[PDB]
Structures are given as C-alpha cells and as structure tokens.
Amino acid sequence: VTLGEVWKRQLNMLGKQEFERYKVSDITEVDRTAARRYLKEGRTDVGISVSRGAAKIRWLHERGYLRITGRVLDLGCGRGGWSYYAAAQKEVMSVKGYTLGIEGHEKPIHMQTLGWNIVKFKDKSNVFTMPTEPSDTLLCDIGESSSNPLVERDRTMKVLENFERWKHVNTENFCVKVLAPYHPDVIEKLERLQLRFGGGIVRVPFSRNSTHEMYYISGARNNITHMVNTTSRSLLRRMTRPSGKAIIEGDVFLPTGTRSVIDHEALKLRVDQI
Numbered sequence: 317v318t319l320g321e322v323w324k325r326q327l328n329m330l331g332k333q334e335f336e337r338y339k340v341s342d343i344t345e346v347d348r349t350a351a352r353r354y355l356k357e358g359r360t361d362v363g364i365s366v367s368r369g370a371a372k373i374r375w376l377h378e379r380g381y382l383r384i385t386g387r388v389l390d391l392g393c394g395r396g397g398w399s400y401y402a403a404a405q406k407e408v409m410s411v412k413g414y415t416l417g418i419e420g421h422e423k424p425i426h427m428q429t430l431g432w433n434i435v436k437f438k439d440k441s442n443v444f445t446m447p448t449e450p451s452d453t454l455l456c457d458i459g460e461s462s463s464n465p466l467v468e469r470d471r472t473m474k475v476l477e478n479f480e481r482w483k484h485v486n487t488e489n490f491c492v493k494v495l496a497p498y499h500p501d502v503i504e505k506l507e508r509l510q511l512r513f514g515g516g517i518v519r520v521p522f523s524r525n526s527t528h529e530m531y532y533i534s535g536a537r538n539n540i541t542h543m544v545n546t547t548s549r550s551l552l553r554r555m556t557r558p559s560g561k562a563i564i565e566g567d568v569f570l571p572t573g574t575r576s577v578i579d580h581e582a583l584k585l586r587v588d589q590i
C-alpha cells in the first residue's frame with residue numbers, strides 16, 4: 317500500500333535483463349577492478365578497500381552527513397570496509413569492529429591501510445545480544461534483504477532497536493542502515509528516535525536500485541516521511557525509464573601505515589589471529 321511496497325512488488329516481477337538494467341540505472345558505482353585483483357592475489361601492501369560498502373561511508377562522511385571521530389564502533393563490520401575507512405580518518409583514535417563471521421557470513425579481512433594498528437576486530441560476535449560499550453561514533457551496516465517484505469520490516473526494526481541499546485550519552489555521531497525504511501512501523505520508529513536523538517535519513521547514491529535501503533545519520537535533520545517517499549518515487553521513476561547506465565567513480569583508495577593517536581608485538585599477535 318506504500319509506494320515502497322509497490323516498488324518491491326514490481327522489482328520481483330522484472331525479467332533478468334530488465335532487473336539487471338534497472339538495478340544500475342543512474343546509480344553511482346566505484347570501479348572495484350583493482351581492489352578485487354589485489355584481494356585475489358592476497359596483497360596487504362596496497363591501500364585498497366576490502367569491500368564495495370566503503371564507498372557508502374566515504375560518501376556519507378565527505379558529504380557531511382556523518383562526523384567520524386574519537387572511539388568508533390562498527391556493528392556488523394563483515395570484511396571491515398567501514399572499519400578501515402574510519403581508521404584512516406584524522407580525528408579517529410580507535411576502531412572496534414564486531415561481526416558474526418559464521419557460515420556464509422563475511423569474516424574480517426586483514427589489511428594495512430592507514431590506521432590498521434588502531435583497528436581491532438572480533439568475529440563470532442552477535443551485536444544484538446553482546447554487551448555494549450561507549451562510542452563517540454556508532455556505525456551499523458546491518459539489514460539482510462528478503463523476498464518477504466515483513467521479514468525485512470522485522471529485520472529493520474531489530475537493527476534500530478539494537479542501535480538504541482548500543483547508543484551511549486557520548487554517541488553524538490551515528491550511521492545506521494535502514495533496510496526497508498517505507499514500512500509504517502519503521503517510519504514511526506525513526507520518527508521516535510529523531511524526537512530523542514535528532515538526525516535524519518538519507519539515500520546513498522551507491523545503493524543499487526534493487527534495494528530501498530537508507531541510512532539514519534547524525535549530521536543532517538530532515539523529514540523522515542518526505543525523504544523515504546522521495547526515494548520511493550525516485551526508485552519508481554527509474555523503473556519506468558531505466559537508463560541502464562551508472563556513474564562510475566574512483567574506488568576508496570587509502571594510504572597505508574600506522575597512526576599515532578606503538579606495540580608491534582601485540583599487533584603481530586592481533587594480525588596472526590585475523
């Protein structure tokens with residue numbers, strides 16, 4: 317009944333060729349060719365990003381939707397694309413990434429982009445049930461798509477609920493994936509969070525048109541219903557007139573090395589484990 321649900325229904329009726337043409341229509345895309353070859357080759361001496369997701373947080377950060385600073389927590393870090401990005405940032409002092417890393421889930425990848433020494437990963441960690449800890453910057457990129465819209469609704473709600481559990485008084489900066497933002501319960505939850513914590517919701521152009529995912533962020537205030545509806549209408553318009561062409565931009569390439577705000581023995585042990 318929402319435009320979002322209409323979008324989702326139509327998406328799953330498209331032919332293969334049509335779905336493929338649609339999913340990239342007028343989106344932005346980083347070229348991952350170089351990073352993929354270095355990952356395959358298993359190099360750790362090159363400043364590449366371990367995932368395509370790093371482009372999302374770079375956009376959010378550079379645009380000013382998110383300040384990344386102090387003690388950064390990254391919930392559902394997977395390979396760690398957001399964790400390594402954060403670690404390379406001037407005002408960041410530490411990064412802690414948590415992820416399941418169970419069968420069929422990505423495990424943290426060892427890399428040596430700038431600030432790798434201030435990043436700690438722990439897999440086999442369920443962020444929904446584990447103890448919380450303070451953060452200045454709280455990131456969560458969780459929300460697994462499903463053909464059942466109600467499963468997506470429930471998954472979105474759980475992510476938002478867990479964000480509120482992890483948020484400390486000093487957590488002034490945040491970025492939380494909202495997988496399916498158009499469900500009335502999700503809109504309501506977002507509005508209730510905003511009443512307490514401010515912020516707003518944004519569509520990242522690096523998201524494919526095959527997902528309606530948006531991000532609840534600390535660095536801008538906006539009207540939740542309007543932004544979500546605006547995105548719904550944009551995904552629908554692109555569906556009526558698919559260009560089949562994405563805007564290609566350069567990938568998240570980073571310098572390498574360690575930061576000052578160094579115990580190489582404990583670092584080696586940390587890398588041995590990853």
Ligand SMILES: C[S@+](CC[C@H](N)C(=O)[O-])C[C@H]1O[C@@H](n2cnc3c(N)ncnc32)[C@H](O)[C@@H]1O
Binds near residue numbers: 392416443444
């Ligand atoms: C792959 S995306 C992370 C992408 C990441 N932002 C990047 O740039 O590399 C979501 C990750 O969250 C993890 N995840 C889902 N539910 C989780 C949970 N309850 N606790 C910890 N991690 C979870 C998934 O295993 C998945 O790897």
